[PDB]
Amino acid sequence: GSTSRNFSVGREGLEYVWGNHEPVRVWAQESAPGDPHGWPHEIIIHYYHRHPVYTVIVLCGVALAILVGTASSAACIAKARRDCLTPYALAPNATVPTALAVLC
Amino acid sequence: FEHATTVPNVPGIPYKALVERAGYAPLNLEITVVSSELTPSTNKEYVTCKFHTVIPSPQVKCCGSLECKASSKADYTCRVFGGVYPFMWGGAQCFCDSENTQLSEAYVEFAPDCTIDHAVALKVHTAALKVGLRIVYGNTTAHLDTFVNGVTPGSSRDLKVIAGPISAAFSPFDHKVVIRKGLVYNYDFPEYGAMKPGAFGDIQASSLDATDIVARTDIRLLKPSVKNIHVPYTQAVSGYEMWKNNSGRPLQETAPFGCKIEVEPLRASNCAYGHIPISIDIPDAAFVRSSESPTILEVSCTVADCIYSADFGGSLTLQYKADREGHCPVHSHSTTAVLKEATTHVTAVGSITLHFSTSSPQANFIVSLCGKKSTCNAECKPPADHIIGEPHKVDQEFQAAVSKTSWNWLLALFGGASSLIVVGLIVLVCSSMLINTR
Amino acid sequence: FEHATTVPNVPGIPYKALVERAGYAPLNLEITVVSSELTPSTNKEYVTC
Numbered sequence: 001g002s003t004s005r006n007f008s009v010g011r012e013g014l015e016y017v018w019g020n021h022e023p024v025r026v027w028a029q030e031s032a033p034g035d036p037h038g039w040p041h042e043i044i045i046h047y048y049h050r051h052p053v054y055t056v057i058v059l060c061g062v063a064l065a066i067l068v069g070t071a072s073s074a075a076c077i078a079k080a081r082r083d084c085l086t087p088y089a090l091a092p093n094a095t096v097p098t099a100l101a102v103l104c
Numbered sequence: 105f106e107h108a109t110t111v112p113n114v115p116g117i118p119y120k121a122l123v124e125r126a127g128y129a130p131l132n133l134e135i136t137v138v139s140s141e142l143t144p145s146t147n148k149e150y151v152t153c154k155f156h157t158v159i160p161s162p163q164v165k166c167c168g169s170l171e172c173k174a175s176s177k178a179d180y181t182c183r184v185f186g187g188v189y190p191f192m193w194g195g196a197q198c199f200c201d202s203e204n205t206q207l208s209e210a211y212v213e214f215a216p217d218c219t220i221d222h223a224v225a226l227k228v229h230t231a232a233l234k235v236g237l238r239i240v241y242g243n244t245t246a247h248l249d250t251f252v253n254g255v256t257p258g259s260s261r262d263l264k265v266i267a268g269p270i271s272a273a274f275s276p277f278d279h280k281v282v283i284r285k286g287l288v289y290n291y292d293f294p295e296y297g298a299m300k301p302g303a304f305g306d307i308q309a310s311s312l313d314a315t316d317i318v319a320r321t322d323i324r325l326l327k328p329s330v331k332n333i334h335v336p337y338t339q340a341v342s343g344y345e346m347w348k349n350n351s352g353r354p355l356q357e358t359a360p361f362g363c364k365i366e367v368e369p370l371r372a373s374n375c376a377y378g379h380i381p382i383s384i385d386i387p388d389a390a391f392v393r394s395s396e397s398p399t400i401l402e403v404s405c406t407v408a409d410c411i412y413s414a415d416f417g418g419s420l421t422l423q424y425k426a427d428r429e430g431h432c433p434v435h436s437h438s439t440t441a442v443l444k445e446a447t448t449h450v451t452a453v454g455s456i457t458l459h460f461s462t463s464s465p466q467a468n469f470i471v472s473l474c475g476k477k478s479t480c481n482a483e484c485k486p487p488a489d490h491i492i493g494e495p496h497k498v499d500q501e502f503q504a505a506v507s508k509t510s511w512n513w514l515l516a517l518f519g520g521a522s523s524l525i526v527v528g529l530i531v532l533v534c535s536s537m538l539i540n541t542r
Numbered sequence: 543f544e545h546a547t548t549v550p551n552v553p554g555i556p557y558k559a560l561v562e563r564a565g566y567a568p569l570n571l572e573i574t575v576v577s578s579e580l581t582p583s584t585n586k587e588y589v590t591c
């Protein structure tokens with residue numbers, strides 16, 4: 001009849017031979033929306049249309065890294081804080097009040 | 105002097121490289137592959153086509169018996185019958201009231217148009233590649249052609265060249281391949297000796313004019329019912345034609361890597377895969393030395409615009425203050441920027457506009473005029489025409505595919521996390537070793 | 543290629559712009575409306591005098 005036929009072409013290329021014509025080769029380059037130099041969110045609506053299974057794992061990697069860094073540093077320095085409460089019961093005063101203002 | 109490099113294997117696009125020695129001037133070296141055929145070593149087994157059942161005029165023996173022999177022609181089938189009484193036009197062709205016998209034999213052989221319409225069944229293995237490439241050294245050119253195993257040089261006028269072995273050695277063919285009328289297929293035909301009735305490989309011959317052919321297509325005879333004389337027979341459908349109906353698309357348009365497959369030497373021209381290593385020697389007649397070469401001073405490149413595409417998108421201007429005038433090589437020492445202008449003509453206070461093409465989202469590479477380097481940053485934009493009829497001259501390298509800012513965000517975002525872990529560890533150690541001594 | 547631009551609707555006064563391709567020199571582009579007609583869809587009912 002008369003029909004539209006969607007195809008898909010990556011970086012490596014594609015040819016099509018319609019009837020008794022000669023083959024017509026076509027290579028496809030990137031025009032993903034956004035901008036790799038604009039600082040906001042549009043820097044990763046670009047790298048999602050190009051290689052989508054890599055951007056999600058690298059974003060989850062850095063989000064897991066920042067949460068584990070914040071949690072591990074907070075827990076370890078809180079343990080190191082509680083390992084320095086040798087003056088208790090307040091019957092003498094605190095040793096360095098500037099250090100207690102830093103800590104408490 | 106000897107210089108070795110590893111070009112990509114895509115027919116058509118060059119690979120820019122330099123050579124340099126102690127006390128000598130640099131020299132440009134672009135080489136490209138213009139034809140690359142992949143021919144395998146074939147071995148023919150048999151030649152087959154559509155058959156033609158030949159039935160001779162049936163014997164009849166009157167008031168007697170008749171038993172039949174064994175013959176060597178293809179699919180010979182005999183059968184005798186007791187008590188027939190045949191009529192030709194003048195009736196009663198036998199003087200024997202229902203005690204006579206007849207013979208009925210049939211066999212099979214080639215049709216008279218199989219000298220054009222025959223399929224050939226081959227068996228291919230160990231495809232070895234050959235390259236026609238174009239060496240350009242020191243404003244001189246040379247055309248040559250070499251085998252690509254790493255031991256066989258093919259020279260051209262004092263220019264030796266060792267093509268090392270290709271990384272991914274393969275062929276587009278299987279172990280078994282069949283050809284009719286210039287169309288290669290990719291089929292699994294039966295061995296010469298195992299005939300299946302009503303499938304491909306039905307007639308067999310080592311050559312199409314041979315005498316001792318082999319067939320098995322179940323000629324079975326039937327008892328003559330009617331009084332007129334003829335020989336009833338049935339036969340399976342021709343396996344060559346009911347293959348030819350279901351042949352599928354040929355391997356001229358289903359083979360990978362852009363291979364164009366011809367038939368008459370059974371080659372596979374212009375396949376695009378892998379990398380090849382090349383080791384050439386350059387004669388000393390082209391290596392000009394630095395005592396007479398035009399040396400260079402005060403170079404500072406800068407960019408004006410950059411797209412990253414397959415066409416030459418970027419364009420950079422350049423300043424240079426040479427003391428003398430001549431021809432100095434221009435090159436970029438990256439692997440993501442290929443530079444179009446191979447050579448230039450320098451003057452005292454002039455300026456050169458160049459062209460390049462990239463795939464990295466930004467350009468941080470160094471260009472080189474006549475011996476010494478120069479650096480210049482850029483900022484490249486995505487293009488709009490996202491289908492073009494020209495292949496990419498570069499690769500991506502998968503680390504420079506991120507810009508400065510997209511690299512910079514995530515690297516700062518977990519550098520801060522690692523640094524706060526380090527400072528928590530050191531304040532932990534400091535407080536612990538302060539208190540445990542008490 | 544095609545270059546999008548919103549010219550204002552004031553008859554006579556041009557709106558200059560230049561276009562830019564990579565590797566090619568920039569090219570100017572002047573756009574001006576010179577006369578604009580506004581025609582509706584007309585349905586006649588009657589005639590009186």
Ligand SMILES: *[C@@H]1O[C@H](CO)[C@@H](O)[C@H](O)[C@H]1NC(C)=O
Pocket residue numbers: 242243392431
């Ligand atoms: C070609 O190379 C030779 C090598 O000495 C050089 O003298 C000559 O000027 C070059 N020719 C051109 C046109 O650049």
